[PDB]
Design a protein around this ligand. Structure first.
Ligand SMILES: CC(C)CCC[C@@H](C)[C@H]1CC[C@H]2[C@@H]3CC=C4C[C@@H](OC(=O)CCC(=O)O)CC[C@]4(C)[C@H]3CC[C@]12C
Ligand SMILES: CCCN(CCC)S(=O)(=O)c1ccc(C(=O)O)cc1
Ligand SMILES: CCCN(CCC)S(=O)(=O)c1ccc(C(=O)O)cc1
Length: 1402
């Protein structure tokens, strides 16, 4: 052990000296076999694994050649070393055996290295963990020999120069080899760099650099985010989940069947298989993350020990200089290793969470396409979309939290043990305090969650009322109702503000508890430890290692209740998900899709039922249809024709009797379903584009005139936003899609509901007629009209869920029996300006005082640490300072006082912040709501309603929820950083200089991160939204998809969308880890520079200063990273204030009241005069009304029907001053609208909208929200509207609840209510507007009679497009191209040489 080197093996005497150097024998002994030992103990395994499983990949690039060249240079160097050693035999007496046995080992090990490097070419990771770790170990274990040789040669020791020079060259080449191994290999551009990067890069996430640079120069486009590897793509993980889930689902299903049969001898579903299956399918990543976290946790408790060693070294005045530096270097190395481990664990955990969300969403979709009818009925579209949107996120969060709920326990236990070893059994006081603080955290978390749910509900109701307000802003501005509809939502917002303030107070309390736990624990533990006994003393090692352990334990202590609460929530979410997935699949035994048969349709005594709990809807049926034969099944309402079609599709359950169907089928229902996108893609429906067939199906249907009518043309847009296509157009496009799909059989279910006579007849003749495009294709038609009955070739009559007889129209006219009576019954007819705006909303005094009080908190904290330093120092002297109860009591009291001052200052800061942010949100929403209203109608016409609704929902929610927390967190992080830096610089002022470059470095990283992160965030928001929406689109129209047999196409599309979102979210996760590695390196650099400065100045500052400098420099590693992430979040969610301020500054119309007031009756019950008028719908675009002048007398029923131009509809808009009059004005009995107010004039003028809309709520304020009319007057008003009967049958009174939809307040009721409102307005000027011919004639007759009998004395306008109801007008006005050429009564109009206008009487 010593004879083989001819030198001293171990000698601690050299170490125990100011200039210490390790013995050369041990140095060439152990520091040489350690890297070679690591290499030779694993090289066979790596070589075998690579050579056994390998492809034919092989290339020779610059890197492979360079690494091989340098390794053979190492080979040559070891060879010449051996040559020199053997030659020196005659130089000396007997060379030591080491001098000539090391070169042989180096030769063999470099041959092994050459083989390893060559073998790596087969694999895909060129520089894997083995080689990089070997190089790192070699460099680290050789730096000792390098320094020893250089130190020996330094002191003029001219001995064996050649060997030293050769070792220097070999070490330099090893350094360059490690440098090369760090670099990522050249890329094949067929895989994402995450899988082809070198081990050091994959550890340090430097392979992301390119993307970040790509984000800084130009905005990131969805094509610039690298794809994910095939491991995480939704198809692969979903297949793995299904494989590992089928067995568990079968076991749970059999157990559920056994339980049900035992109970019987709906709330029970096969459960407790989702968690088992997910764990079984992800156990590998679960284990990798668990081991990585365990290593990091065992590695996080080395920093306090190193700090204790450093304090002990500085305290001793005879300590060796060569120490201390070793402690600082070790602290840097441990922090680096721990940061690498932690970030890799985070990447593993987050990617596992994202994969869990992917597999759950994809399994949801795959189940939605085969769910049985009953299970589909048990849910709803909104609820199921919410399930996929929310429960999957809950499961992802639970996955992220499960790997941490155990690491927190390990960290707490180890930290408790180490605190015990430091401070004796007196840490139980700290244990008690910080355990009593845990149920408080749990309770606060639960209360916060409940208040958040209540806030969500209130925000939903506010969104609903806001959307209703914005949809019908037209009539709202017409009737001058803005103050009332503003006050209602103002009250709702006040209630939401109260709830939000409560939530903010609870969050502030929770964060105050988290921030004050370490201070309270420190005070209590130190006080109890000193007071419990006089023997034990508090020195700088115990106190500051204990503070470091308290800081280590603060987070996992406060992250237990949150994780627990989230786990108990995900429990219910998992139960819901596995209740959905466990529902049985739909049955296909009855409906057999036989490949080849006769007539393609056979009803083998089928008996289908909507619900087994009820009587069979249809039973004992028998019908066969020849191929190519049109069948028009008809019957009474509710007979079961729609039920018959559903049974044909197989969307219903049956008791007995199978149905045999052959060939492909197409189907169109009465309720047409339209996907999001283009009309073209709707028509193709995933089939190949064919211009000929496309043109044919446009010609066959009525779509070309509609397409030319459409604004966007063939592409245009439809769905979601769309253009609000009419029902007839939807039916037409669905019929066209069915025709294009060219199936063998067609199932038409009332596709001509909102279709006129001639157009529907043409469509039938050209599509489903004898000469239609589907002559060779059989069709089963459901119809209600009689025009198409003569064209049927096989008509079946359906009654009470049972067919009666078959036949054709010839049978109809021949039998004169059942068919005759049936037919007879049938036809009977950013920049700082935005931050300034938000802060000004907050209030400058409030932010000034918040900043001042947080600064006072940090000053108190620095004072507390200085006092602890002095308290620990007083033990070293022991020259009368101690051994007195007064001194110890004063120390304890002042320490407690400083802790209390810090606590109350921080609490005052946070409470003031909460109140200021609440006030700011209130003011911002008030301003935005006030200014959106009273805005001119042009702004509403241009901007879509969805845009303003999103501005009121999402941006206001951001401003009220995520902006205060982000700004407070930024201030917290920044003042933590400033306190720590000004407390490190208080000991060694030289450190101030190192702030100059470090900050610059930090700044650089931040900039790059921001310039990418924003974009990634945006990309996520752009791609997450479609998935959910598509799910709705594929779950509302499930019968259509099942009929067309296009299931796999929809499944593939959903998988594609999931992958497109997955790549964005994965790139975001990696960007977070990239920034975290960089900034944890910056914080670690801060702690290492501080430790080096403390060691250098060890002869000036005592050990207590080292303790309180390092114990806080160790806490800065994460604060920098979180400061940058909070800066990025503040930049991301400040755009809400930007948009709100953009919408506040919108233009406003004429003011409410312009000083001058009208008399008691502004209309003066008299005439009106139109002077020279020059008015356009929007300014300087195109004048509409030009060169018109007229005078309408009192009580005149003046009607105007000009032409098809917009000039017909302009007058009303010009009568309420909605359109500003550029030329002339309007005189009404000497009263000019120009020189008078606006809202007062609109309030006392009436108008019937052409498209009236309803306001949600009651019926009293939907009629008169101002409540300025007595209930008797309102009742009389409905009495002339004869709506008294409807409300009397409904909830009696004026305050009956009303809502949208046809359930309540049907179209006739709506028209009656509008007429009543108009007649009770009681203004002498009446303006009408009619645009729809679908209104019932009785309603028109009654409103005309009541107008003529009540409003005859009042002037009326009657803007009516129809001609058959205007001859009764007293006067008729005609306006052409914006000009009037005639004036007089209808008799005078027809007196002009005979029908000179409105000639067309039909
Ligand atoms: C992305 C989601 C998970 C939001 C995460 C919130 C964190 C980014 C915020 C919330 C609480 C903040 C922490 C709360 C307390 C502090 C104490 C601070 O150290 C001190 O100030 C000493 C204690 C004292 O001053 O009394 C270091 C920053 C830190 C960890 C803050 C860093 C940023 C945190 C973790
Ligand atoms: C929602 C997860 C909660 N966590 C558990 C992770 C295993 S977490 O520890 O608090 C954390 C850490 C780091 C980041 C980040 O870098 O964005 C986010 C969250
Ligand atoms: C949400 C905050 C996340 N951080 C805490 C900052 C105070 S963190 O630095 O990223 C971190 C650190 C350590 C552990 C662990 O030990 O499990 C987890 C997360």
């Amino acid at each position: 052990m010593d004879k083989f080197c001819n030198s001293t093996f171990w000698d601690l005497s050299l170490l125990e000296s100011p200039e210490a150097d390790l013995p050369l024998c041990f140095e060439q002994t152990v520091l040489v076999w350690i890297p070679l030992g690591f290499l030779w103990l694993l090289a066979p395994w790596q070589l075998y694994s690579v050579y056994r499983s390998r492809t034919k990949r092989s290339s020779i690039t610059k890197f492979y050649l360079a690494k091989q060249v340098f390794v053979v240079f190492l080979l040559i160097l070891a060879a010449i070393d051996l040559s020199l050693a053997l030659t020196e035999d005659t130089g000396q007496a007997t060379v030591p055996p080491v001098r000539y046995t090391n070169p042989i080992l180096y030769l063999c090990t470099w041959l092994l290295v050459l083989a390893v490097q060559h073998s790596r070419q087969w694999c895909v990771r060129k520089n894997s963990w083995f080689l990089s770790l070997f190089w790192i170990l070699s460099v680290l274990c050789g730096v000792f020999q390098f320094q020893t040789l250089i130190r020996a040669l330094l002191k003029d020791s001219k001995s064996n120069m050649a060997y030293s020079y050769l070792f220097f060259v070999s070490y330099g080449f090893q350094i360059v080899l490690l440098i090369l191994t760090a670099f990522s290999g050249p890329s094949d551009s067929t895989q994402t760099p995450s899988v082809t990067a070198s081990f050091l890069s994959s550890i340090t996430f430097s392979w992301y650099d390119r993307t970040v640079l790509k984000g800084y120069k130009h905005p990131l486009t969805l094509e610039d985010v690298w794809d994910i590897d095939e491991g995480f793509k939704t198809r692969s993980v979903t297949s793995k989940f299904e494989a590992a889930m089928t067995k568990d689902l079968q076991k749970a299903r059999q157990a559920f069947q056994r339980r049900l049969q035992k109970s019987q001898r709906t709330k029970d579903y096969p459960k407790s298989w989702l968690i088992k299956s997910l764990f079984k399918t992800f156990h590998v990543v679960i284990l990798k993350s668990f081991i990585l976290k365990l290593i990091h946790d065992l590695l996080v408790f080395l920093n306090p020990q190193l700090l204790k060693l450093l304090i002990g070294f500085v305290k001793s005045s005879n300590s060796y200089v060569w120490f201390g530096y070793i402690c600082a270097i070790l602290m840097f190395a441990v922090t680096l290793i721990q940061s690498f481990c932690l970030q890799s664990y985070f990447q593993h955990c987050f990617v596992l969470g994202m994969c869990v969300r992917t597999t759950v969403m994809s399994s949801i979709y795959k189940k939605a396409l085969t769910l049985s009818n009953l299970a589909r009925k048990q849910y709803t579209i909104g609820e199921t979309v919410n399930l996929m949107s929310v429960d999957s996120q809950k499961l992802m969060d639970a996955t992220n939290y499960m790997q941490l709920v155990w690491s927190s326990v390990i960290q707490i236990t180890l930290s408790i043990f180490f605190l015990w070893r430091e401070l004796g059994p007196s840490i139980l006081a700290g244990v008690g305090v910080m355990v009593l603080l845990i149920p408080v955290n749990g309770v606060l978390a639960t209360k916060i969650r409940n208040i958040q749910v209540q806030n969500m509900k209130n925000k939903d109701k506010r969104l609903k009322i806001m959307n209703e307000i914005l949809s019908g802003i037209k009539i709202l501005k017409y009737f001058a109702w803005e103050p009332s509809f503003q006050e209602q939502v103002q009250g709702i917002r006040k209630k939401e503000l109260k709830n939000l303030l409560r939530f903010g107070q609870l969050q502030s309390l929770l964060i105050f508890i988290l921030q004050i736990t370490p201070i309270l624990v420190s005070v209590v533990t130190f006080s109890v430890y000193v007071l419990v006994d006089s023997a034990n003393v508090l020195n700088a090692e115990k106190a500051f290692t204990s503070i470091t352990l308290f800081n280590i334990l603060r987070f996992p202590l406060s992250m237990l209740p949150m994780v627990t609460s989230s786990i108990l929530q995900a429990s219910v979410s998992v139960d819901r998900l596995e209740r959905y997935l466990g529902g049985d699949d739909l049955d296909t035994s009855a409906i057999r899709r036989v490949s080849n048969f006769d007539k393609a349709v056979k009803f083998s005594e089928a008996s289908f039922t909507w619900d087994p709990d009820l009587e069979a809807t249809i039973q004992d049926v028998n019908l066969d249809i020849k191929p190519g034969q049109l069948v028009a099944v008809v019957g009474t309402v509710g007979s079961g024709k729609s039920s018959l079609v559903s049974a044909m599709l197989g969307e219903m359950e049956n008791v007995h009797g199978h149905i045999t169907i052959q060939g492909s089928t197409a189907y169109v229902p009465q309720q047409s379903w339209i996907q999001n996108g283009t009309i073209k893609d709707n028509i193709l429906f995933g089939s190949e584009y064919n211009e000929k067939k496309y043109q044919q199906v446009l010609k066959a249907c009525a779509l070309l005139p509609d397409l030319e009518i459409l604004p966007g043309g063939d592409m245009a847009e439809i769905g979601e936003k769309g253009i609000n296509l009419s029902g007839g157009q939807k039916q037409r496009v669905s019929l066209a899609r069915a025709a294009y799909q060219d199936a063998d059989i067609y199932i038409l279910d009332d596709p001509l509901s909102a279709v006129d006579a001639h157009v529907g007849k043409h469509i039938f003749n050209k599509v489903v007629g004898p000469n239609g495009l589907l002559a060779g294709k059989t069709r089963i038609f459901v119809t209600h009209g009689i025009h198409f009955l003569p064209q049927v070739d096989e008509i079946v009559v359906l009654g009470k869920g049972t067919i009666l007889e078959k036949g054709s129209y010839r049978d109809l006219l021949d039998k004169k029996g059942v068919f005759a009576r049936n037919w007879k019954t049938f036809m009977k007819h950013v920049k700082f300006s935005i931050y300034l705006k938000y802060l000004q909303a907050v209030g400058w005094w409030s932010i000034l005082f918040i900043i001042l009080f947080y600064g006072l908190n940090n000053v108190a904290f620095i004072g507390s640490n200085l006092w602890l330093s002095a308290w620990t120092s007083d033990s070293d002297n022991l020259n009368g300072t101690n051994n007195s109860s007064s001194h110890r009591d004063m120390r304890i009291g002042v320490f407690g006082a400083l802790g209390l001052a810090q606590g109350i200052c921080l609490l005052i800061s946070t409470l003031w912040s909460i109140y200021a942010c609440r006030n700011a949100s209130k003011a911002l929403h008030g301003q935005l709501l006030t200014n959106i209203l009273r805005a001119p109608m042009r702004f509403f016409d241009t901007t879509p309603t969805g845009r303003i609704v999103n501005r009121f929902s999402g941006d206001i929610s951001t401003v009220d929820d995520l902006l205060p927390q982000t700004l407070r967190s930024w201030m917290m992080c920044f003042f933590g950083i400033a306190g720590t830096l000004v407390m490190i610089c208080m000991a060694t002022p030289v450190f101030a200089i190192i702030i100059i470059p470090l900050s610059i470095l930090y700044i650089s990283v931040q900039v790059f991160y921001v310039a990418t992160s924003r974009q990634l965030r945006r990309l996520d928001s752009v791609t997450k939204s479609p998935i959910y929406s598509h799910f709705s689109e594929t779950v509302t129209g499930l019968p259509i998809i099942r009929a067309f047999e296009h299931q796999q196409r929809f499944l593939a599309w959903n998988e594609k969308q999931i992958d497109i979102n997955q790549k964005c979210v994965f790139s975001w996760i990696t960007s977070n880890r990239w920034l975290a590695i960089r900034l944890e390196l910056v914080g670690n650099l801060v702690v290492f520079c501080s430790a080096l400065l403390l060691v250098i100045y060890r002869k000036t500052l005592t050990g207590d200063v080292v303790g309180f400098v390092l114990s806080n420099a160790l806490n800065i590693t994460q604060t920098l990273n979180w400061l940058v992430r909070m800066t990025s979040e503040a930049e991301t969610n400040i755009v809400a204030v930007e948009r709100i301020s953009e919408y506040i500054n919108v233009e406003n119309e004429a003011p409410w009241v312009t000083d001058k007031r009208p008399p008691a009756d502004w209309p003066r019950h008299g005439e009106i005069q139109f002077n020279n008028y020059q008015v356009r719908y929007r300014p300087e675009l195109d004048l509409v009304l030009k060169g018109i002048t007229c005078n309408i007398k009192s009580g005149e029923k003046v009607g105007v029907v000009g032409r098809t131009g917009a000039g017909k509809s302009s007058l009303t808009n010009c009568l309420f001053r909605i359109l500003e009059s550029a030329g002339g004005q309007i005189i009404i009995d000497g009263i000019d609208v120009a020189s008078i107010g606006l809202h007062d004039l609109r309030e006392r003028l009436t108008i019937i909208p052409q498209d009236p809309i309803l306001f949600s709520g009651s019926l009293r304020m939907n009629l008169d929200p101002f409540n300025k009319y007595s209930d008797e007057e309102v009742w009389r008003a409905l009495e002339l509207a004869h709506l008294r009967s409807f409300v009397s049958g409904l909830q009696l009174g004026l305050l009956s609840e009303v809502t949208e939809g046809g359930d309540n307040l049907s179209i006739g009721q709506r028209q009656l209510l509008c007429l009543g409102r108009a007649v009770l307005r009681k203004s002498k000027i009446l303006v009408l507007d009619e645009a729809t011919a679908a209104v019932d004639l009785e309603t028109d007759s009654l409103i005309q009679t009541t107008i003529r009998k009540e409003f005859s004395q009042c002037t009326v306008i009657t803007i009516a497009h129809r001609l058959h109801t205007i001859m009764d007008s007293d006067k008729i006005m005609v306006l052409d191209n914006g000009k009037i050429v005639e004036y007089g009564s209808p008799e005078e109009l027809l007196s002009n040489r005979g029908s000179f206008y409105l000639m067309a009487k039909e």
